[PDB]
Amino acid sequence: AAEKGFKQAFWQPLCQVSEELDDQPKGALFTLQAAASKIQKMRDAALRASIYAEINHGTNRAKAAVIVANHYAMKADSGLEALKQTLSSQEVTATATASYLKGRIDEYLNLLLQTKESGTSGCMMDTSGTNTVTKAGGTIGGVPCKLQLSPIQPKRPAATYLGKAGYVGLTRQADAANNFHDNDAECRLASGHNTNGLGKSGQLSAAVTMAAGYVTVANSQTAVTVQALDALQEASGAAHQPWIDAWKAKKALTGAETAEFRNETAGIAGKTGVTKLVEEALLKKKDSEASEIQTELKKYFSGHENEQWTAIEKLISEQPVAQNLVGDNQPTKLGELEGNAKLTTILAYYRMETAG
Amino acid sequence: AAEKGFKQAFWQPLCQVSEELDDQPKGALFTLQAAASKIQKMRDAALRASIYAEINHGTNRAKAAVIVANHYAMKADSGLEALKQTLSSQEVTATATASYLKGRIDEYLNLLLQTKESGTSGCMMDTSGTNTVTKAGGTIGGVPCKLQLSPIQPKRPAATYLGKAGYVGLTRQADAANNFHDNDAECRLASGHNTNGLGKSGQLSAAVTMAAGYVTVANSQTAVTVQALDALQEASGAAHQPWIDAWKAKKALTGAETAEFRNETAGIAGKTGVTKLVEEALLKKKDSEASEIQTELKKYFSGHENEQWTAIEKLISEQPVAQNLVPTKLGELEGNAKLTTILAYYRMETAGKF
């Protein structure tokens, strides 16, 4: 009934949104960290190939390794440029818009939780509208609803209550007066009228919106209404704008999965950096046909498909560095070494050996 | 008077904080971008040094360039590691804690703003308590108070209303009944008692805290009380914990200002990477003596002090590269991927020279 406390059907979907928004900074940390890790993997491969080229300087395979090193080094450079120009803004914006909306929701939900008179009369009721609910640890009436921003640790980005379409649990409500409102719990936050709601001497002078514009509290003796937020469209200046802002920002995330961060499977001449290097440094001529690039590539990779690239990479990975550069009982094969700084110092040594 | 609408002295300092927390995401973008920029500058110097070494293969200056290239590559590596492990967590946590707290405040302020019965009676009153306030543009009562998360572009955030000590404007209140409450404006959000406040059939069963634990609304006919937040100490499980968390996270930011992102200025032997490489590659003796290291360095830098490091970097920057690979001096070129493609060409020719 109008002007009564809100049963769990009304506030549980808000808890679920709040708990999912809680994970957005965890996903931002995940993605920022993954971008760096994938740049670092690209850089490690560029360094392994560079070390192989320096150790084998002069051979046809060393020239292949230079092509490989250039490939992965260009990949690492582009990934850092993408972290700087694109992912940083995406992830800060999604963190900020989601955390702000979560604050708007939690302050409303926290008000309902506390605005009660008894164990059976209040603004926040259980599923059947029998008992007012209590917070117990992270749960409210058995519902995960921390009403807090949890400590931020990396968590894979997940989209359940906030998806590409919108807030999938916040549908058009068919019957708020029976599905949202209790039958007898008293709650002055359910209307702006003075008899049973927020008004003192008379009704509030207008409808009041709560939870960043989601619920509209009429100043008449009528049930609340809610925005349908499950099929959003871009807009400005809406009363529920923080909902749109967070939806727009989460939908915009690519994660660390754009081409900078992924390995290429294509033929060798189609791989980043390769053909420009062949034309300028090996063929030493422009306007060379595709057959000429493939023939020159065969000199260094035995072929021009992805399988021959992989074969060169395996040679790089099995190549050992000197035992004194990597611990004592430590691995020496390049493929068993990782870490940019560590491989950087090893490259420097072999580069100095080449200088002599 | 108790149980009445809130004059501007109550909510204005909350506007001040909300407006400043709006800046914290801008500062996170600024720092994440600055760190990546500084890494990129380190890498460019690594690449210029490496290209110089390739073109000048065999000379003592080329070996100095190898030492220089190792230095900057290590600095670039460490910066990306710091970005990943430390700066990202710092700036995501500050963005989130500030934005969350700002949402908690803005919902409460937006609720007071709307809960009114007339232009003279409501929950959000002006300075003198004569009229309820209205939001006009980005101000409420003449005070910046947008109650929005504004678009994010990089900017250093102000640290005026939330600083190292806490929230300067959220002081111990000497007289809430008269400084925070009007005497006649009606506002059911001002108490939990049933006659004038949130209670219907009787008072609420306990006090209610609002704005993430800042204001406590008694279930009796008494004035509100507020937390003093201007001298915070680290704590957990507090009713006002979101205030503590945003304060802790802002205080903890280093920026892109740690040793990974700054250039070194002392002698060559103490510079990142130098002595290990000299010992391993040139002296062929680990744990060598200062004198030995510095004698060996003199053969390539013509000295062992920062001024000779700078001199080699000038030589690196003046080295020309082929016009068709691109301004042709290495110091006139910037951009990691671009300098990478150039290093690749010269390395391919080094292989051909055999």
Epitope: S78, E81, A82, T258, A259, E260, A266, T275, A290 | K338
Partner: nanobody
Framework: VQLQESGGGLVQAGGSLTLSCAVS????????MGWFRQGKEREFVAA????????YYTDSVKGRFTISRDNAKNTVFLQMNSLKPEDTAVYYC???????????????????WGQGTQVTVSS
């Protein structure tokens, strides 16, 4: 990631069209951009390298079409002059990371593709 083409329409022969392709969700300056067109096989039209240093065309549009990029607007343009009925096709934007040679940009697979924009030129 979205590559969105614009500027299609019905033109007369010998006229001109300017295709635009706005890129979102990507670091535009990291990508070479090219144009393709397609009950016939899809064919390469033109491309520009990631840094803007080179442009490539198929012969049948050489001297008639001009590709250009505007990094500040995240947009690659295809200027189409002296149009001919055989130029009727759907024109697709496409993006290839750090693309830098005619081989890649005419004959390799790209990383991202637009949805197309229709270009019909009357006789």
């Amino acid at each position: 990631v979205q590559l969105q083409e614009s500027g299609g329409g019905l033109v007369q022969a010998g006229g001109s069209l300017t295709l635009s392709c706005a890129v979102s969700g990507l670091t535009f300056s990291n990508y070479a951009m090219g144009w393709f067109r397609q009950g016939k096989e899809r064919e390469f039209v033109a491309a520009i390298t990631w840094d803007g240093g080179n442009t490539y065309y198929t012969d049948s549009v050489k001297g008639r079409f001009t590709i250009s990029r505007d990094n500040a607007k995240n947009t690659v343009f295809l200027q189409m002059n002296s149009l001919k009925p055989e130029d009727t096709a759907v024109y697709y934007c496409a993006a290839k990371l750090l693309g830098s040679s005619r081989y890649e940009l005419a004959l390799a697979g790209y990383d991202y593709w637009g949805q197309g924009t229709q270009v019909t030129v009357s006789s």
